Write a protein that binds this ligand. Structure first.
Ligand code: 2VT
Length: 246
């Protein structure tokens, strides 16, 4: 669907990413929206439209939804549904010390449900992190930006070979982000240092709020070889097993 600039009311500025500015607005003085205006030079306008085109044909309750595309006036923008609490990364940083391990695991499950859908759809995310996840009504997590050495798997570090298994490693890191309440993976480590530690066999430490079982799954996502990593469909059942038990 096509949206006119006159149909949008820019209320306030709510974020600035590498690819553009995000605003809180209204469409047709009705629906509360998030307007993603393009950043010139950061990416081609064609790729900005294609990103949204792909997303509009992927329907899952745990993936962000668009209202449409506003192309008439530059800066060109994407009109998404509003996610009240914003990015998971920011929502974890503030609200830190208030989360329970039952809530945090439920967030991983929300993302895994979404990721298992994209996996079946043969769609590779390539940048799955807490910053690319959005918190909405009743703390539901939705995946966004489905059109970063700290989230990269060894195949990505040295050979740039992305797969659903590359996203599995990323999800393992996203899990650490979630159970660390927004903390940065490999805190004061350089890109060269992250590659060296992982290549030697080292991995992110067990976060305080995570159980031994949670870390067991994290380490299953962090297997050097991608064939020894579970698919998101297997991963989803693994997390649910601990969700109902203890
Ligand atoms: N009401 C309100 C309100 C006013 C100011 C800030 C906030 C918190 N906040 C919410 C967001 N939401 C988003 O950024 C957001 N929502 N859907 C999105 C889709 C794509 C990218 C970003 C999106 C960001 N900050 C909420």
């Amino acid at each position: 669907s096509v949206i006119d600039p006159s149909e949008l009311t820019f209320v306030q500025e709510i974020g600035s990413g590498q690819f553009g500015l995000v605003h809180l607005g209204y469409w047709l003085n009705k629906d509360k929206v998030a307007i993603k205006t393009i950043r010139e030079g950061a990416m081609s306008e064609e790729d900005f439209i294609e990103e949204a085109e792909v997303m509009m044909k992927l329907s899952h309750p745990k993936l962000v939804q668009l209202y449409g595309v506003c192309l008439e006036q530059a800066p060109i923008c994407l009109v998404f549904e509003f996610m009240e609490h914003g990015c998971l990364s920011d929502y974890l940083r503030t609200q830190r010390g208030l989360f329970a391990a039952e809530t945090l695991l439920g967030m991983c499950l929300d993302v895994c449900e979404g990721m298992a859908y994209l996996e079946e759809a043969c769609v590779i995310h390539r940048d799955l992190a807490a910053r690319n996840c959005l918190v909405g009504e009743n703390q539901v997590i939705k995946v966004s930006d489905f059109g970063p050495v700290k989230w990269a798997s060894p195949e990505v570090f040295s050979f740039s070979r992305y797969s659903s298994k590359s996203d599995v490693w990323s999800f393992g890191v996203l899990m650490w982000e979630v159970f660390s309440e927004g903390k940065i993976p490999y805190e004061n480590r350089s890109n060269s240092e992250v590659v060296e530690d992982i290549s030697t066999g080292f991995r992110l430490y067990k976060p305080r709020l995570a159980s031994t079982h949670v870390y067991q799954i994290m380490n299953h996502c962090w297997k050097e070889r991608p064939e020894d990593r579970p698919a998101f469909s297997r991963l989803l059942r693994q997390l649910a097993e601990i969700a109902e038990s203890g």
